[PDB]
């Protein structure tokens, strides 16, 4: 049975960073590394398992996460580093065994006046535990005075929408990220 890789890579509409998408991969024979030849992905770094003998191995289980980041945050999708993307939106464990893929989507997720449909968390009260998703749009309490649900002085909205005009530098360009994690179980994925 072929794997539905086009349902994740070639999906019509894509998730934000604070609300990253998810897709479970099982019961298929998967053609890894044939994607490596395609020129769209500007990053195909893999950890623990070399990206060449992927086809010669089988894993009990595979996890796929799809989201959209900007520019100078592709280096943030990796183990062992800090920052607004890594500490508040998506954190990776130090003992990561999988791959990281990202490609440019200039003509899809960017418009001249700005595509404000992509969000990311910039406020948080604690760091992001490895492999955690934060969806709460509750107002962050920055000072001693309680926010009480009204956003104003020392009371700011936790999310900020990516500005994202195509006329800006590619350090702000769309970069659709696809993360695969590799873990009994049946034949699983091979």
């Amino acid at each position, epitope marked *: 049975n072929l794997c539905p890789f086009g349902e994740v890579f070639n999906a019509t509409r894509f998730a934000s960073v604070y609300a990253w998408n998810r897709k479970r991969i099982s019961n298929c024979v998967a053609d890894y590394s044939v994607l490596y030849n395609s020129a769209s992905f500007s990053t195909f770094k893999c950890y623990g398992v070399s990206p060449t003998k992927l086809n010669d191995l089988c894993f009990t289980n595979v996890y796929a996460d799809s989201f959209v980041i900007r520019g100078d945050e592709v280096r943030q999708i990796a183990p062992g580093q800090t920052g607004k993307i890594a500490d508040y939106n998506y954190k990776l464990p130090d003992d990561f065994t999988g791959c990281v893929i990202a490609w440019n989507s200039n003509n899809l997720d960017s418009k001249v006046g700005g595509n404000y449909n992509y969000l990311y968390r910039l406020f948080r009260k604690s760091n992001l535990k490895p492999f955690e*998703r934060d969806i709460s749009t509750e107002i962050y309490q920055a000072g001693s005075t309680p926010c009480n649900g009204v956003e104003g002085f020392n009371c700011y909205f936790p999310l900020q929408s990516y500005g994202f005009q195509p006329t800006n530098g590619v350090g702000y360009q769309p970069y659709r990220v696809v993360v695969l994690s590799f873990e009994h179980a*049946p034949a699983t994925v091979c």
Partner: antibody
Amino acid sequence: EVQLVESGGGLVQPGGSLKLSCSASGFTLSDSAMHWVRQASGKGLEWVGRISSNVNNDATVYAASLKGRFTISRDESKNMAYLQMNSLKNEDTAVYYCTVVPVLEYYQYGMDVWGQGTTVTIFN
Amino acid sequence: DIQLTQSPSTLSASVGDRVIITCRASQSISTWLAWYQQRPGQAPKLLIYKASILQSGVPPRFSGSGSGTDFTLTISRLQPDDFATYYCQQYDSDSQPLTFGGGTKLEIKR
């Protein structure tokens, strides 16, 4: 401070129609999948259906027993989820719960936010 | 379709005893199983997910295990607030229906 409020339940003649609304508060309902679960009086939990995220194009699956009578919809403008029911009969007299559980979508960690339930009663 | 059977339907125990609850499936579901608890007139709380991992905030006395078709919920130490009904649920695919268990009403012994 994440809540889930439902409404719309009431007396319904058999074979009529009713629409329920699960309103999300404190978070955007369009990002995560939404589950509908019902339970009759003194009976066990009965899974109704599920709507997916906006990213997954709002996929709908329903139980076999609810063949062609139930439809799940949502409204991103009002941050609410809908439950459509046709051809009502005594199996449907139950307390219906709206819940958002991100773990059943094969995630790792999440939160179990539930609603208060809306009693739907079918009378002749 | 997959039907879940909970055994037993009800049992009685005092405070501080170890209690086992079994949830058997028709077809092998791998590890997609969740456990719930429901107090009277109350919304169910999520307890165990993926059959082994604890939810944030529930006390450590709860423990779950199992794989394939046999699954177990264990309370190492019973307490007055844990005496309610429990349900098991399987995820097992994004395209086929999801099902609950028959329930296991846990009552006190006096």
